[PDB]
Amino acid sequence: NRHYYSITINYRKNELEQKMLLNLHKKSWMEGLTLQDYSEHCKHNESVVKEMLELAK
């Protein structure tokens, strides 16, 4: 640290970055029409998750 110091770092985020990046990331975790992968896992409850239910037991 002698002869050689540092400086603090803060940020800035405006609401277009906030909601564009926010809905960008929520949409990056959501689907297209968003109803798509629902019934898939509803019916993997009948096909796959029953095995995970027995293993859970």
Binding site: G32, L33, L35, Q36, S39, E40, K43, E46, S47, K50
Partner: protein, 152 residues
């Protein structure tokens, strides 16, 4: 060949009688039909095996369809006995008809209607029906939404 190709309408082999008969008569082309009937028994085996092979083959074609042609009616349309249809079923049990339904009560058969597991089968139908409705609903939606942009 094209009649043996696919989607065989159940056709009359008496229409094939004149085809094979003049197929013996003409020497214009395929002259060794008399050689197909060359041996006293062998061409007869080819012939009964041939009618047999197509009369099993078309059953394998209509066996794709679940449309239930109700084989007691089919034996009447075929003008053949139900006892040699039991022989046909002896060719079917070795031809793996083993997924089918017969009746003590009726003589009508079913090639489908399994035990139908709803966690497997109606699962699967509900899956591809629902999902294909969703994503096929998705595409031309935004596509026609782009088609109406060009009217402006």
């Amino acid at each position: 060949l094209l009649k043996l190709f696919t989607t065989m309408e159940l056709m009359r082999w008496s229409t094939l009688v004149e085809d094979y008969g003049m197929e013996l008569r003409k020497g214009s082309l395929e002259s060794p039909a008399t050689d197909v009937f060359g041996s006293t028994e062998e061409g007869e085996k080819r012939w009964k095996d041939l009618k047999n092979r197509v009369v099993e083959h078309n059953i394998r074609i209509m066996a794709k369809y679940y449309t239930r042609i109700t084989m007691k009616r089919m034996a009447q349309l075929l003008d053949l006995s139900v006892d040699e249809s039991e022989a046909f079923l002896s060719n079917l049990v070795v031809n793996k008809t083993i997924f089918a339904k017969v009746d003590r009560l009726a003589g009508i058969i079913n090639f489908q209607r399994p035990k139908d597991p709803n966690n497997l089968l109606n699962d699967w139908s509900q899956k591809l029906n629902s999902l294909m409705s969703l994503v096929n609903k998705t595409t031309h939606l935004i596509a026609k939404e782009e088609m109406i942009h060009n009217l402006q």
